[PDB]
Amino acid sequence: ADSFVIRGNEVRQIAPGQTGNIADYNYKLPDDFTGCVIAWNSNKLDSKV
Amino acid sequence: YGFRPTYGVGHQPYRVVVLSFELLHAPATVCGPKKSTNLVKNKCVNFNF
Amino acid sequence: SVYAWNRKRISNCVADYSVLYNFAPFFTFKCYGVSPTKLNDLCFTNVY
Ligand SMILES: *[C@@H]1O[C@H](CO)[C@@H](O)[C@H](O)[C@H]1NC(C)=O
């Protein structure tokens, strides 16, 4: 289980085919991969002042 | 990043946890719920190893 | 308006599709064709 925070535009870009600022320079998921990811909203509980 | 709890919606964060499973390899450690049954050794069965 | 849309021509310019996520985030991008990350790989004769 690997947990982190990433805003709103790469939740579906964490797929193996998609690449960019996150897959090349952050958490990279391999071309073949078995497993499931889980994400939820953080509109106020992880937004702060 | 960083903002007040109301912002331009697209920057609102997300908490992502992955679950990268793996199979084959060593004897298993994670198993899930068990319904284990005693053994027979000379007849056909519907086994689950 | 949805009945009279503007058909803007984009030509003769370098298109960096990486820096798009700041102008209007929370999109879908629904790429019926070229992949989301593959725009910055090939040339386009006309973009509208
Ligand atoms: C749109 O233009 C305004 C200035 O009129 C600017 O303040 C704003 O940041 C621009 N929005 C973009 C580039 O997403």
The terminus-to-terminus CA distance of chain C in angstroms comes to 17
Distance, in angstroms, between C26 CA and closest chain A CA? Answer: 6
d(CA A30, CA B20): 11
Which residues of chain B have a CB within 8 Å of the CB of C26? 9-10
- Partners of C10 in the beta sheet? C47
Candidate from C25, C35, C37 with C-beta closest to A9: C25
Give CA–CA dist B22/A19, Å, rounded.
23
Q: Is A47 exposed, middle or buried (0-12, 13-18, 19+ CB in 10 A)?
A: middle
> Whole-angstrom Cα distance, residue C37 to residue C34?
8
Distance CA A44, CA A48 (A): 7
Give A27's contacts in chain B (Cβ within 8 Å). Answer: 18
Q: How many CB pairs under 8 A join A and C?
A: 17
Beta partners for A37?
B18
Q: Residue C29 contacts by C-beta under 8 Å, 6 or more apart in sequence? A: C36
